[PDB]
Amino acid sequence: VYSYTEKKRIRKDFGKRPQVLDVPYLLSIQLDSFQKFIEQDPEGQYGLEAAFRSVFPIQSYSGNSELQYVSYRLGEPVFDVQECQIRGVTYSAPLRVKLRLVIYEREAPEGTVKDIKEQEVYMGEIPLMTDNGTFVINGTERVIVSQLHRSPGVFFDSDKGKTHSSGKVLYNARIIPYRGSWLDFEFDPKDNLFVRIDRRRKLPATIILRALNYTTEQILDLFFEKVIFEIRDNKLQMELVPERLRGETASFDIEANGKVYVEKGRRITARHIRQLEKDDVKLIEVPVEYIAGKVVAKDYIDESTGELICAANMELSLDLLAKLSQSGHKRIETLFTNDLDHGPYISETLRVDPTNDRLSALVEIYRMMRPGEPPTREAAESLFENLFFSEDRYDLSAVGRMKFNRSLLREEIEGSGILSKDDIIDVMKKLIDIRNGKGEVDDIDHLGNRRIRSVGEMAENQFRVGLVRVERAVKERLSLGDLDTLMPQDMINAKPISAAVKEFFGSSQLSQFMDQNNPLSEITHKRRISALGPGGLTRERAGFEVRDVHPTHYGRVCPIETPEGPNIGLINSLSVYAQTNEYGFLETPYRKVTDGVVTDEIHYLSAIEEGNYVIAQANSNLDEEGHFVEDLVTCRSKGESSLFSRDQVDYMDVSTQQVVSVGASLIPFLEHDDANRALMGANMQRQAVPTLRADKPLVGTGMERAVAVDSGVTAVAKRGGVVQYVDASRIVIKVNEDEMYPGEAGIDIYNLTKYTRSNQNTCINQMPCVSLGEPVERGDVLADGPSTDLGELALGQNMRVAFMPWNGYNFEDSILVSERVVQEDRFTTIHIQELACVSRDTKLGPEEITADIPNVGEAALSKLDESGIVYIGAEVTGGDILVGKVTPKGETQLTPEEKLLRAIFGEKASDVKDSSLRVPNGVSGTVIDVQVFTRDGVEKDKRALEIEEMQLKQAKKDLSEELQILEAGLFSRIRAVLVAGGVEAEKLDKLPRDRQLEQLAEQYDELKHEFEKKLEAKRRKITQGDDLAPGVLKIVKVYLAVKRRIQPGDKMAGRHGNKGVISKINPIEDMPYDENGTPVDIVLNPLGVPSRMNIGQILETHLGMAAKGIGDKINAMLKQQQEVAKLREFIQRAYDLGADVRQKVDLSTFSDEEVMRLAENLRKGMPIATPVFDGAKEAEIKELLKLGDLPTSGQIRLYDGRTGEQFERPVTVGYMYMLKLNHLVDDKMHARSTGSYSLVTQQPLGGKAQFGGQRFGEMEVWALEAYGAAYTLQEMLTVKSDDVNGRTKMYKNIVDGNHQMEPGMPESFNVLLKEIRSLGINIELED
Amino acid sequence: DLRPLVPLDGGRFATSDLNDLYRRVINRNNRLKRLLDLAAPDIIVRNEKRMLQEAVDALLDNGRRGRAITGSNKRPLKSLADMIKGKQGRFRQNLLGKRVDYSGRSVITVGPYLRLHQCGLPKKMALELFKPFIYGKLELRGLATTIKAAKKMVEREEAVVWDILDEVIREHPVLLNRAPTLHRLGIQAFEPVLIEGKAIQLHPLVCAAYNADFDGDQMAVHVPLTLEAQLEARALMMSTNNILSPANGEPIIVPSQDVVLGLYYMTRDCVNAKGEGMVLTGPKEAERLYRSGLASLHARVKVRITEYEKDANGELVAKTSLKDTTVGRAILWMIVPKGLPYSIVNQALGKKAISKMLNTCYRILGLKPTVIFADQIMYTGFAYAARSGASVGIDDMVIPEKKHEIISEAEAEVAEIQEQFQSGLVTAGERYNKVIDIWAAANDRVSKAMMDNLQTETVINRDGQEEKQVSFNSIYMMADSGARGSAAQIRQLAGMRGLMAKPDGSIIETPITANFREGLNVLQYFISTHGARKGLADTALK
Amino acid sequence: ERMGHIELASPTAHIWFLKSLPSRIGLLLDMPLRDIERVLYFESYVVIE
Amino acid sequence: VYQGETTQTLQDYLMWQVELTPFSDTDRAIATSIVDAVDETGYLTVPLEDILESIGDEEIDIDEVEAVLKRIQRFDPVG
DNA sequence: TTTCGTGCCAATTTC
DNA sequence: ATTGGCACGAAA
Ligand SMILES: [Mg+2]
Secondary structure: OOOHHHHOOOOEEOOOOOOOOOOOOOOHHHHHHHHHHHOOOOOOOOOHHHHHHOOOOEEOOOOOEEEEEEEEEEOOOOOOHHHHHHHOOOOEEEEEEEEEEEEEOOOOOOOOEEEEEEEEEEEEEEEOOOOOOOEEOOOOEEEEOEEEEEOOEEEEEEEOOOOOOOOOOEEEEEEEOOEOOOEEEEOOOOOOOEEEEOOOOOEEOHHHHHHOOOOHHHHHHHHOOEEEEEOOOOOOOEEOOHHHHOOEEOOOOEEEOOEEEEOOOOEEOHHHHHHHHHHOOOEEOOOHHHHOOOEEOOOOEOOOOOOEOOOOOOEOOHHHHHHHHHOOOOEEEEEOOOOOOOOOOHHHHHHHOOOOOOHHHHHHHHHHHOOOOOOOHHHHHHHHHHHHOOOOOOEOOHHHHHHHHHHOOOOOOOOOOOOOHHHHHHHHHHHHHHHHOOOOOOOOOOOOOEEEEOHHHHHHHHHHHHHHHHHHHHHHHOOOOOOOOOOHHHHOOOHHHHHHHHHHHHHOOOEEEOOOOOHHHHHHHHOEEEOOOOOOOOOOOOOOHHHOOOHHHOOOEOOOOOOOOOOOOOEEEEEOOOEEOOOOOEEEEEEEEEOOEEEEEEEEEEHHHHOOOOEEOOOOOOOOOOEOOOOOEEEEOOOOEEEEOHHHOOEEEOOOOOOOEOOHHHOOOHHHEOHHHHHHHHHHHOOEOOOOOOOOOOOEOOOHHHHHHHOOOOEEOOOOEEEEEEOOOEEEEEEOHHHOOOOOOOEEEEEOOOOEEOOOOEEEOOEEOOOOOOEEOOOOEEEEOOOEEOOEEOOOEEEEEEEOOOOOOOOOOEEEEEHHHHHOOOOOEEEEEEEEEEEEEEOOEEOEEOOOOOOOOOOOOOOEOOOOEEOOOOEEOOOOEEEOEEOEOOOOOOOHHHHHHHHHHOOOOOOEOOOOEEOOOOOOEEEEEEEEEEEOOOOOOHHHHHHHHHHHHHHHHHHHHHHHHHHHHHHHHHHHHHHHOOOOHHHHHHOOOOOOHHHHHHHHHHHHHHHHHHHHHHHHHHOOOEOOOOOEEEEEEEEEEEEEOOOOOOEEEOOOOOEEEEEEEEOHHHOOEOOOOOEOOEEEOOOHHHHHOEOHHHHHHHHHHHHHHHHHHHHHHHHOOOOHHHHHHHHHHHHHOOOOOOOOOOHHHOOHHHHHHHHHHOOOOOOEEOOOOOOOOHHHHHHHHHHOOOOOOOEEOOEOOOOOOEOOOOEEEEEEEEEEEOOOHHHHOEEEOOOOEEOOOOOEOOOOOOOOOEEEOHHHHHHHHHHOOHHHHHHHHHHOOOOHHHHHHHHHHHHOOOOOOOOOOOHHHHHHHHHHHOOOOOOOOOO | OOOOOEEOOOOOEEOOHHHHHHHHHHHHHHHHHHHHHHOOOHHHHHHHHHHHHHHHHHHHOOOOOOOOOEOOOOOEOOOHHHHHOOOOOHHHHHHOOEEEOOEEEEEEEEOOOOOOOEEEEEHHHHHHHOHHHHHHHHHHOOOOOOHHHHHHHHHHOOHHHHHHHHHHOOOOOEEEEOOOOOOHHHEEEEEEEEEOOOOEEEOHHHHHHHOOOOOOOEEEEEOOOOHHHHHHHHHHHEHHHOOEOOOOOOEOOOOOOHHHHHHHHHOOOOOOOOOOOOEEOOHHHHHHHHHOOOOOOOOEEEEEEEEEEEOOOOOEEEEEEEEEEEHHHHHHHOOOOOOOOHHHOOOOOOHHHHHHHHHHHHHHOOOHHHHHHHHHHHHHHHHHHHHHOOOOOHHHOOOOOOHHHHHHHHHHHHHHHHHHHHOOOOOHHHHHHHHHHHHHHHHHHHHHHHHHHHOEEEEEOOOOOEEEEEOOOHHHHHHHHOOOOOHHHHHHHHOOOEOOEOOOOOEOOOOEOOOOOOOOOHHHHHHHHHHHHHHHHHHHHO | OOOOOOOOOOOOOOOHHHHOOOOHHHHHHOOOHHHHHHHHOOOOOOOOO | OOOOEOOOOHHHHHHHHHHOOOOOHHHHHHHHHHHHOEOOOOOEOOOHHHHHHHHOOOOOOHHHHHHHHHHHHOOOOOO
């Protein structure tokens, strides 16, 4: 089953593994995020609802009134996307929010509702996302890039001995909220716990506990297990737990039941512990020195004296033991602090801790956060409460709470957004457990610890940022009591919200101009992940480990698509099948393997879930029922891969291309390329410029259609039907009767984009690919965009290539190109440039755009129309006038000289200047479009009226088509009734069409009225004036189109990392040729293959040769008229070739017309698909070569075009897919002799556009110093630079034929002297 | 004039940072003067004095004390110290380096026809770069009587200004520079040749000094103006003066790639080639036979060779003898100067042999014969590399027939050691080390088998016997000559890729047992990406 | 090349000779930098005689 | 930071043409005086007697000033 | 009291 | 980030 678009030209697929999951829609990451932001959520988890509920209700300090949020709504945009791009405005919708103000009474319990007033208010404009995932901010498309940031929660890390000279690991924990302040707990080389707040001065870790209303006994009970000493009238008879003595040496004699298990000088072993457990040894006799180090837990007070004998957390001595013995105490509580497992850290911290109450801790915290001011109990309490326990300043979001609970091994997922005492205590306990040796630190580069934040979430955050300022303004203005007269509309102002939204969507770090070289550039830009941006990393502070490939990237982040340079590893690309959780974690699909057979149910697993299973590889053999045939299956288990049994497999990969991205899946024979060259080719593939004619790859992977259709460059049928009208600029489809809505003329009108300018000054142009009367279905391609051929991506051209050295012209990546390639315009591109002329208002009257310029000649005004604007189609060069403008300079004073001048030459010439728009030097092209924008209230000129009539004609034509269809239907209804009533049909056929019946006449009148209203509305929109700027009267934009041809110095590339520069254009009779006299197009150097190890280009060349041979056979069969049976037999042989491939093409179901159309499309070579890691084998390539009567080795004998002598060895000749990159030597060449200089430094400016000079930096100065070229260096430093007098002396000397200089002093040194003197330092030259 | 105001469209005369700081200082000073005049209370004048102190501190050095004051867009204002210091300060931006006049830049292509002292300069660039010289030359010969006449003539680009330009650029060096200039060989002087197009043509032999390749590199060109600068360019910076490395004294004009491949191909012998065994009068007869298709470039023949040696006083004395050589070696002998022995070419010439030949020529004869010899070597290498027709195909990467058995035996040994581990005889780390050693031995065996199969071929003798000679495989020829490729890369092409390491550094125990001719699967490719990106990141960050 | 001047109403310390780590004023007067800053920014007094 | 760009005015163009014309020192001083007294519309704003006075040398007559003015009037633009 | 350990702060990072 | 120098506090 093939669609109409695919049935015209079927691409032969060499894939062998059946598809179980279809490639998803490639732009879901943008559309889903923005829809979550915009759609109204009844519960309010995401979007504008959450932002509104997180601020409202807003109440005054006195509590007399509050503002309550009800609902919100988005209005219809004034203009659509195309109108916004034409005018240069934002595509946005107005936000109307229903607020409600309530008034409460006094001298009543709680608040009595005196009055409630509800009204909707205008909150500003929200930019809208288009159908292709972009934003039109100022007439230009923009993309907001998703961000890979650190997830909220608690993370445990360490330093691997790098901080300390002794190489001791110091563990730490950090709590990071979504909104709030960080909380750090860290260890010391002395093993003391410390707490840090907001990355500020270190504090002991017991300060926070004391501020949380904890006493010393409670802290010791929390962090230690009590040991009970009972004074059984004989030397402190002891109860012993056998497990306590593990890895311990007895410093005394341990005996039980009259038997000495452990003697003096003997340690305790595991067998001894087992014996003690078996015998249930409890009673133990210990000496008085066994307490010489034991630390008391609680406080003991003598009953009689009533004084405090000792404080908590202090080791006891002999005197203290005697005092407690004589005081009649029979219970002692101690802490078990063995140095092996239960290290004494909290006790040491308490020893370090000076504070012993709750207020001193608050004072210390207040002084740490806000030093240099007196402490107050109320202020300190408020600060501590607001730090971590205020829902308005601290938020541990749902993902943050989930991660917190998962790290603490809790059960519940839901929870509160603020910290509590239990959370901090558990974090401390887990850190101490990690210190003791039971626990692991977290891997921060693990993709389970990193989150994806998209455009909707960032927009919500910025909206809340504006909304809190709005709340502050409301609370400031709500103190005044005037509740009987004010209204919510005048109470709130939308300026902060609109400003925040504008600054997010226009000048953010992750908001960028869309890359529009080709559809692949746009797809890659919209699927891009960045670690930079606000709240991310810095490319200087990043490091090596964050830039590395992690195992968890498998199936989620492409490992071979990242820029090379400072941003390597920081900008990533999404994989083909990757998704995100509801928490923003990347996940990938897998097939579930049950009872040893691979099923077809798909589960999306994240990085945390993935590592708990054994997942089989994609390149794993199966059977007719789905059983592994290899006894040792290669699988990934715990971030590592190894061989596993057939019954230990849990999941399997869905595809062999789920690990690469969209750009890397378009490289054929990727598995034969080195990874560095694969990265280079993936980067180079998305900077190719579209040419005049599109050429399908002829060797592909099968992903071209997905890229072409999921991009918005093509015209895709919304409904099925028949092509009623087809034209170079519009398509009209007559929709089928079963897809039409009631009471509707069913037609779809598609207006094609014709020769418009992209963000890269290239051409965007759509061409129809359907014919008149042919059937179409939903989803079919109607028109091809740039770099698209019949619905497939086509980035380059197919070139006949030979790999051999040719006289040094392909030395070091150089490329030798034939003259026929230039003659056939195969790499010719169109570039469009825009120029603007702005007419403003001055004090001496306004500037006038006109053709009556006095000072210029009659020839220079030949290209201007009556309105002073250049004609459409005019060929212009540098210096020509495009828009004629004059600036007033009139003044009342008139000397006799001015009177004579005006009398002789006329008054128009005087009191006016010439500020016309001219073509910049070195610029040429053809005027293809002129746009005029006029301020409202200003008289329109003739050109603007002509443009308006042009715009009105198209809308009139569309409305006329719809009205014509509707009136034809209505008259068909009228005629049937008229005949049924009984009339003569001939009189109806003779009379004109003016002609129950009254009801249909009323319907006719209503239809006419409705279409007149539509036309009037469209005319009113078209004739609407512009709002340009303060003081701007008129704007005129001119578009120039030029064609660039291929030439030496232009950069060419393939898809396998092979790039080069054209060195020579070789005439046709100089190129190598084969036995039939066919020359090659391009000669490439073979020496570039073995060192780079990009073997995929040789295989691609051989397969392209085979495909072109099949196409040659088809073309030869077409030229001599052959019966359709022969053609379909040969094409069936071609499609059936392969080794158990998954594609079945049956031409018996094809009609003769369809077969002939396919054969006509296949006469330039049969396209072939080789999926990545599932491509063709060399045996299949050789079979296809044998089918087309070509040498199996892929090498033929060539002859020298200059001598006719055969080369001594066979040469690899075939077809490659070449790309023209946007690095044109036309933009690179620049020279300067003299020009303009800076005002301050008096040095030449920089840049080709400024006609600037080349910088002679410090390294060049060092190179000249190492040569000894003192005069060349002094000439560089003064005469070619900021030395003003020598500059003019040298020019005069050179013109006179005297090559000598007088150096002088540079100006920048004088500037430096003045700047140093401005600092109050006396610096001067002496002698 | 050192702190100017910025005029923009619409009449907005915006102020700079220094003017703002000066305005703040002046406002505070005026308010303080008025307050001191009016005898204000001390509590107010103290605050005003503190604010004046802060304003002066912000003017002199903004941000050194306290918090830096910001402008309209939340960015701190630039003070005098910020102008003095830093990478964007006066010293490093305007005094230690600066932009200059009479300079241009563009993309570089290759000129294989050029001599070592010549460059290819576009004439559109040269017309702009040499404009005052053209004005002077136009006025000197009466074509233009004033400066505006010459200016208009050059603007119109008349047919005579091109003759004037070719006259004025005749012997006038230009300096070519490629960034970064890591050493003094990054700037060199060349004599221009006016060419059509927009790209600069660079001599191949100087590409190593610049560290340049023809895939997008750009170069800048500067014009010396005074006589001293021109003579310094000719006598110090000229390419023909820079043939030894100042760092270590090694040569820097080493031929590479296509030249090495061509010279290696022509100076090789085949066992049974066309025209073998005939006796020739000299190299000219050898070339005459080769061009006629009567003898092969590799046929082993006897040639009468005359060689000159420098006497004790220093005179060249000639000795003539019959030598056993090949046709290609005799043909190449016509390029060597007269002071060298014939044994320097009677061998297969790799990269090292060609460098040795150049060094011997420089040591025995001097500088001018050496540069002439280098140009002739480059020309001959290019010509015969073109004539050879050397290509690369899929059949060149020959997989050894014994690789599968080696892999199976290694897998069996690994299974045996794993079973021994599961039996409790061995520990974990020692088993890991044993597995690593097993795979290393297997990789070494595969590499040895691949190289043994690749490096030899079988040929038919004159009688009809079988001999073994050095292989004419294209990949083997490229690797053996030193033109391109090493043993490790050929091993990756035709043998197993071997063991891979994690980003931390630990070796993954199971290796990639596939080469690039039969591609890797998904897991092996993902494993290789680790080392690929580690190397790329190190290169980017060092 | 022509400079102007401003007559300050009250003396002001140069920040280069105060905030550079080997403080010239602090070393010359043999006083800590904190006390000098406190006096300069009108936060404490210092006895002159 | 902002610095700006130098612009070439009518007087700058006239002085550039004066520098590249074979004048003597006295003729060059007279030409500098003449170019100084030229307004934006290209007309001489002072009589030749004022220029002769501004020269400051008493051995120069009005004929030399007239000849230098005639030479300058043929610069670009003519007139 | 004098000497040594320890925290704070400034300056550096391509073209 | 890293490194070096200066203040501050604690050791014998
Ligand atoms: Mg390069």
